[PDB]
Design a protein around this ligand. Structure first.
Ligand code: NA
Ligand code: NA
Ligand code: NA
Ligand code: NA
Ligand code: NA
Ligand code: NA
Lengths: 163, 163, 163, 163, 163, 163
C-alpha cells in the first residue's frame, strides 16, 4: 500500500487509483481539468436533515442543499461540465469506511458509488484526461489499477491489516 | 485545531492533548518512559470474535486475545508497569469516531475511556512524566488543555467543521 | 488560512491565490508555461545601489541590474514572453510585509504591484493558462479568490492573528 | 545553513543555535524543561499601544500586557521559573529581521536580546539543560555554535545570500 | 545542491536535471506524457543471472527479463512509444554511484547512459515535452542545466562534499 | 519496513533498530546523551590516503585523520565518554551497502561493525540510555528488535525487494 500521503495538490498519474481517507464533513477533494470536468466531493455526516451548507470549491463559494438519512457517511460528487454550468449531485457513495477513490484511465475518470460493502465503479467522459489535477484535503493512498480489487476491498471494507 | 501531523516519534509537551485519528486495526500508538509506564493501544474493528492477534509493540512481538461484540471500534489500552510485567487490557474506548487522546499533565497520563458519545477521562500515575515519549502510527492533532472541552467534543462526536 | 507549505514545484490550481512569504534576497518563485509566459521574482533588500547580481532562473544563469532606494523590500518581476526574448523588470512590489501573490484566473496571471499598504492587482495575458506551473522557493499559502480581500489585506499589512 | 525546517516539537541538541524566522504576531516558540525553566516568545508588530492580548502558552491561556513604540518588531521573552510562578517579560529583542535564536550550551540557555543590528547574547541558568524541549511555531534553522558569528550576523542583518 | 526531496509525483520543470539516488533493486522512476513517451527505470543489483522479474510500472504489472554480469548496479531504461507498444530495454546506465538523471530540455528528454565514471548524455524525442511528469520512488535532487557539469560529476563519481 | 524517513533530530525509542542509509562522505549521524556517551559516524569513500578532514560534530569543529584502503565504504565511529575527552575511532563498519545501524536496548547502545556481508553487532555501556538522542543526516528506517535478523540482512546485503 503506497501511502499515506498528506494533503496536497498535484496531477495524478494515469492508471493509478487515488484512495482518499476522509476525516471531516467538508470538501474531500477538488478535481478539474479546467475545460470540461469539475468534480468536488463533500462529506455528509450521518443523520443530517435537508440543510444548505456553504463550501469553498475551486476558489468559489458555493451553497449546496445536502442531506443524509442513513447511519453511514455520504460522499456527494458535485459535478459541472463547464465553469458556467451549475453544480449538481451527480453521484453518491454511502460508506462507513470513509474511503473515496478516483482513477484516470482509458480517457475517463472512474470513481466508486453506491453503498458499502457493495459499492461499484462508474465512469465520466472527458476530452482532456491529461490535465485533470486534484486538490486532496485528506490523507490518501495510491494503488495501481493492476491491484484494483484490493482498492475495491478497501473502499467497501476499509483498511485492515489483520483479518 | 493544530494539525493534522503525519505519524512520528517524539516526546509530547506537557499540558497538551494528543488527539490521534486511527485508520486501521493495528497499533495506534506506543507510549512509554522506559521506567514505570508502558501503554500501547490496538484498534479492534467491529464484530470480532475472541481471537489471538499478533502486534509489534515496543520492538517486541506480543500476542493479545482481543474481541469486539459492538458495532463500534474498540481501542484497547495494553498496559504494563515494567518491562518484565505482562501486558493487560487496562482500559477500553468504544468509539465510532476513531479518535484517541492522551495527555501528560499533573504528574499523570490522561486518556479517554468508555463509549462515545459519553467517553470520559481517567488518569494513570507515573514517577517520570517528563520522559514519556510516543510512537504515533496515524495522523494526530495537538490541543491545549485549556481547550479540553473541544478535545472532549472531538473524541465523542468526531471532527466536524459544519454543524 | 491554508498553509504554510514548504517550498515545492507544482501546477497551482486556477482561482486560488498563491501567497508567498519571502525570506531572503534571492529568487522568490519561477513561473512559466514554457510557451508564452515566463516570470521570476527576485527580492532586493533595502538600500541597494545599482548592482549586477547573478540569479539562477529556469535553469539558466542570468544577470540582472537591480537597485532599491527604499526602506522597504522590492520584489522585481522579471518577465519574458519567449525563451529567446530578454528578461526585463515588468513590475515591482515594494513591501515591508515580504508577501508576494500570484493568481491564475480568467485566462490571465494576476499579481500584486505597487507599494504597501496600497498595493493593487494587475494582469498578464496568456494563451495557455493551464500549463502554468511554479517553483516556489519559500513558504507559501493558498487562498481562494472568494477571499481575495483577505489576501489583499495580507499583502499590504502582513499576516496578523491579533489586531 | 541547515534548514528551513517546518514547525515542530522536539528536544534541540546541545551546542546548536536554533534560528527561528517569525512570520506573525503570535507565539514564536515555547521552551521548557518542566522543572525550572519556562520561556515563551510572543511577537509584537510595530506601533502597538499598551494592550492586553491573549496567548496560548504551554497549554494554558494567559493574558499579557504588551506594547511596541518602535518601527521594528519586538519579541518578548515571557519567563517563569516554576509552573506556579507568574510570567514576566524577562528580555526583549527589537528586530526588523524577525529572526530569533535560542541555544543550549554550558548548562545554560542562550538567546539574543537588544536591538538589531547590535543585538547580543545573554544566558539563563538551569539545573536540567537536557530536558529542555521546544515547540517552534515557525520555520527555523540549525546552526552549530562553531558558526555562531554567522548566526549573530543573521540575527542582526537577516538571511542574505547576495551581499 | 537542491535537495534531498522525498519520493513524490510531479511535473518536473524544463531545464532542470532530476538527480535520483536509487536505494533498492526496484522501480527507480516512471516518466510519461501519456502520448508518445514512456520510460521506467528498474535497478538491477550486481551479479544477476538472466531472470524474469515482475515490476509495477504505470499501474500495470509487467515482466522483464533482466541480468547484470557486472560488479556495478545496472539501471535499465524500459521504453515504449505508445501504451500499446511493448517495453524494451532502450538504454542502460552501469553505475556504482546509484545516481540516475533525467532532464527535459529543447523538446527532448535527456538521461545518462554508459558506465561510470565515463557515463554520457543522450536524448529521446517527443512531441509533448510539457506534459512529461514523473513518479520518483527514491530521494532525488534538482540541478539547473547551467550546472550540468556538476550533475555529470555526481552521476559518474557520486555525491562528495569532501575531496 | 518502516520508512524511509527524512533527516531529523529525535530521541529514538528503546528496542528499535535505526537503519541509516548514508549518501555522502560526511557526518552520518550524531548520537549523545550529553553525560557519558558521544558517537558520531563519518563516512569515508573508497581509496582515501591518510588525510585530515574537518567535520562538524555536536556543534564543534573537529579534525580527524581518516583513511580507507578498501574498495568499500568505511563508516568510522568517533567516540568520547565526556565532552572534554578526545574523540577516537572506536569502531569501523566496512560496507558496500552504505547501511548503518544503531540500537538502544538493555542499557546499552548497539551498532554494526566489521566488513559486509559478515558484519556483527557490538555494545557500548551507558548510565543514561533514555537521554540518548540522535541527529540523523540521511534517510533512515526503523526496525523492531524482534526483526533484527532482517536488519542484519539489510546491513550486510542491502535493501532488496527482489531476490
Ligand atoms: Na453518469
Ligand atoms: Na485505573
Ligand atoms: Na502590464
Ligand atoms: Na537576566
Ligand atoms: Na536512442
Ligand atoms: Na568496545
Amino acid at each position: 500500500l503506497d501511502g499515506p500521503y498528506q494533503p496536497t495538490t498535484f496531477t495524478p498519474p494515469i492508471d493509478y487509483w487515488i484512495l482518499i481517507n476522509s476525516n471531516t464533513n467538508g470538501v474531500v477533494y477538488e478535481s478539474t481539468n479546467n475545460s470540461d470536468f469539475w468534480t468536488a466531493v463533500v462529506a455528509i455526516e450521518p443523520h443530517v436533515n435537508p440543510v444548505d451548507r456553504q463550501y469553498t470549491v475551486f476558489g468559489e463559494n458555493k451553497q449546496f442543499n445536502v442531506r443524509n438519512d442513513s447511519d453511514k457517511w455520504k460522499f456527494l460528487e458535485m459535478f459541472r461540465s463547464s465553469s458556467q454550468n451549475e453544480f449538481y449531485n451527480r453521484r453518491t457513495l454511502t460508506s462507513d469506511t470513509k474511503l473515496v477513490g478516483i482513477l484516470k484511465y482509458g480517457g475517463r475518470i472512474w470513481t466508486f458509488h453506491g453503498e458499502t460493502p457493495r459499492a461499484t465503479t462508474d465512469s465520466s467522459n472527458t476530452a482532456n484526461l491529461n490535465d485533470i489535477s486534484i486538490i486532496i484535503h485528506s490523507e490518501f493512498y495510491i494503488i495501481p489499477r493492476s491491484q484494483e480489487s484490493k482498492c475495491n476491498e478497501y473502499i467497501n471494507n476499509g483498511l485492515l491489516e489483520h483479518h
